[PDB]
Amino acid sequence: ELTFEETERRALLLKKWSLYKQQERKMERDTIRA
Amino acid sequence: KNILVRMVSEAGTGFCFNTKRNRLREKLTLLHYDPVVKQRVLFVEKKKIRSL
Amino acid sequence: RRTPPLGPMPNSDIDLSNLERLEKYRSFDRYRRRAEQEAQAPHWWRTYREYFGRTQQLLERKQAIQELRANVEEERAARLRTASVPLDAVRAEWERTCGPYHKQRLAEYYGLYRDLFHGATFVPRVPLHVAYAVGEDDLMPVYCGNEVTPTEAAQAPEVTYEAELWTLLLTSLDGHLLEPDAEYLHWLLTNIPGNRVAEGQVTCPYLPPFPARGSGIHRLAFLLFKQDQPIDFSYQLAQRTFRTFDFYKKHQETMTPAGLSFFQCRWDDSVTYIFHQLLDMREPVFEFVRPPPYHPKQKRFPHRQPLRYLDRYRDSHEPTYGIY
Amino acid sequence: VENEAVAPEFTNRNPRNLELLSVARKERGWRTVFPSREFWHRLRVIRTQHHVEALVEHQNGKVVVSASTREWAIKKHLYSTRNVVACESIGRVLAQRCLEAGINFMVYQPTPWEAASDSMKRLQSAMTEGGVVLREPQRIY
Amino acid sequence: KNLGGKSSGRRQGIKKMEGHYVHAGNIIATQRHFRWHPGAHVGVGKNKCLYALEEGIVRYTKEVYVPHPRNTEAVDLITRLPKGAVLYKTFVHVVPAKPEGTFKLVAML
RNA sequence: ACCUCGGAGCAGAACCCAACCUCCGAGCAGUACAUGCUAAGACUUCACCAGUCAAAGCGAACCUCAAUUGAUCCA
């Protein structure tokens, strides 16, 4: 079983990881093109 | 190989329809529409007309 | 013989030996999108359609969206698929911002413009809230093409057009019993002093809708015209006949169509009373008659035809005996 | 009586007359192509990258009604315009617009995956509870 | 050594060319494969024959081809098609001539 | 050697085309038991026989395969 607070923390974890790896892939592609 | 079998209505009506089945499968029972009763009733294989 | 194509053949520009290199539709969805776009695009070959066919606003909207994003409860509900929307507020904002265009689309679909104004269009900028008072407690609203029974429309409606000289007209577009290209005028309040409607001039008294039985669904339109400058206007059915196109041709300079609202009515018991008492006539009853079934010319020898062939061409089912 | 002068044949010019009487033709062909044209009104849902569109379109192609998350009125009351919440909200708004427009029946033609989608299920439920039956009456011949 | 091949011609093909008035139920074209695809107001029989579902005029057109999502072979062909490509097929259409019916005054109650 | 039936060339494009011409095949199988009843309009192997498709309707649910067969009489 689980709780609402940890579910919300997990959702925010997914959100921030999405942003972080989006920036990672963006910088990788920038280096590739450069 | 298959055999032609007369499926007879269990509704008591003399309604018979011929179907086919494997000669090695068990005697066959269906839910077939009986026009006399105007309803799907059980039909049970009665006799083997011929071997097809 | 090989007549050359009369234009760019489809799948011509893309066609190239580098099929392996070219990216492909990996999804039926993207293929369908492209195919639909191509179908919409015009073509030189025979096709189905031929035969059957500011900055402040942006800033404020961005700030509002940012505030909604910041609101944690909103995000919690969104990710828990439990958030809802205020339907009434959405309706009001639709009216204020983009309601006129969708209402214009509805009117065009219903054929109001092609009939009321013979094709000429106009955006109903001014929202028009019309409601037929039902009982002494409620009132059926007439939004756009909704269904309101003549029983409910027995008494004249309450109109609240928010503005600050107006003319309101109720016109039945397809209720005319004698002339296909004619309308019926029901009530015309002209020179209305702004929002309040009780002070308008009663050019024509209110006549409730009377869609004949078995005559189908009839469409009635509330036309609202802003009156630049006040102007003068000029139970018998011949005088209730009305061509809105001619009327607006006469009053075009001083009138501008700024509001629209229509509803659909079918026959009801109240129509009988309207016909018998108010109009003092025998109510007409119409029926939908399909064309008679087609049969090929009867042959002397209907070869290979069933016995029903002769029944297809006999008129009377009762036995006949000729001379006997 | 002069007022009793009625033409023998009535000419109802309302486009929706026969459709509402359930007598108008509805294209029965296109049995080898998708979607089927056998309808008077179709609910077409377009899920873009950022936005969700829900149109009620007549067989002739005229978009009778529309509900897009790209309108300010709707987009200013929900968090994300590309989620199940957005689809449910646009479905309810479209149901209200259809009821006020007189459109009570439609023919939804989703692909297998679209039908299995949770968002499409929510949109269909929203329309049903709003008062639109996604199954047009059979034509009367 | 070579036996058979004595079958006669099926007499298949188009029975109603474009512009021909067609009554409901008339067979427009008989085909062994899908040469002409069904269009508006045209139905397909079990043997792929196209019959008129309405009374009107036959029109042949070229229209984009969008198979049913459950037609696995066609969906696979599409999935392998390059982007920008659109399939086209010949479709048969019946432009209905007469209206569904007319409203007639039946009784002046 | 063949005799009936179907697919492909000859017969490139509506239909149709011979050959003791070139090649492939068939004389089933499988799934279901509304593979129920009726009924406009059409197709048709160049006749007939036979063979095909089918709107609408009643009643119900919410047929694949090219051939895959055979009349009358009589049992």
Place this chain on the structure above:
RNA sequence: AGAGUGUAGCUUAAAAGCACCCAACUUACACUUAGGAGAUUCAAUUGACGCUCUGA
């Protein structure tokens, strides 16, 4: 010092569509479903904040 100038990666898009990413189904990819971020450089058509090119 001068020229081209200028919407998130792309758009003879006008704040959109394609793009793009992780989660699940996939060995994997792909599809599909769920979600994610995103811009019209700043002031009155004009001037000046940033990029490219031509030079030293």
